[PDB]
Structure 1
Amino acid sequence: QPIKLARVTKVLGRTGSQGQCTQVRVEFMDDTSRSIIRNVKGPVREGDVLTLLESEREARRL
């Protein structure tokens, strides 16, 4: 599965339960107008670019 790039639109907050990572909202650089929620480790702000080797997983799922 091809490697994907995403842009951070909104920083939600620190999970607390899952270590101390940050939940962020990211939108894919493709013109598909998609947006998901991801967990990121390390200092992150708005406008950062994340590299997703797998893009199907969702941070909040049953």
Structure 2
Amino acid sequence: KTPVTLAKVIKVLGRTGSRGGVTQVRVEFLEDTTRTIVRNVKGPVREGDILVLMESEREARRLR
């Protein structure tokens, strides 16, 4: 099964990770834009970009 969802990132909540490569993204689900999640992105990204996810409810904590 492929329950991927597209979420448009609206805010970059700074950067985290051991070496400092992964970024906080506040994504907003393209379906039902009422909902917002924070997640962790490898690679550069700006506001307005969209992301593809398999897991949807996983709101992972800060990597450390």
Whichever residue aligns with residue 47 of structure 2, its letter is E
**Structure 1 Cα separation of the partners of residues 19 and 52 of structure 2:** 20
Whichever residue aligns with residue 29 of structure 1, its letter is L
Could you tell me which residue of structure 2 aligns to residue 51 of structure 1? 52
- Give 1:32 deviation, angstroms: 5.3
Q: RMSD of the alignment, in Å? A: 2.0
What TM-score results when the alignment is normalised by the length of structure 2?
0.81
5+ unaligned residues in a row in structure 2: which ranges?
Answer: none
Could you tell me which residue of structure 1 aligns to residue 28 of structure 2? 27
Compared CA separation, residues 32 and 12, structure 1 to 2 (3 A):
closer
> Which is worse superposed, 38-47 or 51-60?
51-60
5+ unaligned residues in a row in structure 1: which ranges?
Answer: none
What TM-score results when the alignment is normalised by the length of structure 1?
0.83
Whichever residue aligns with residue 15 of structure 1, its letter is T
Amino-acid identity (%): 74
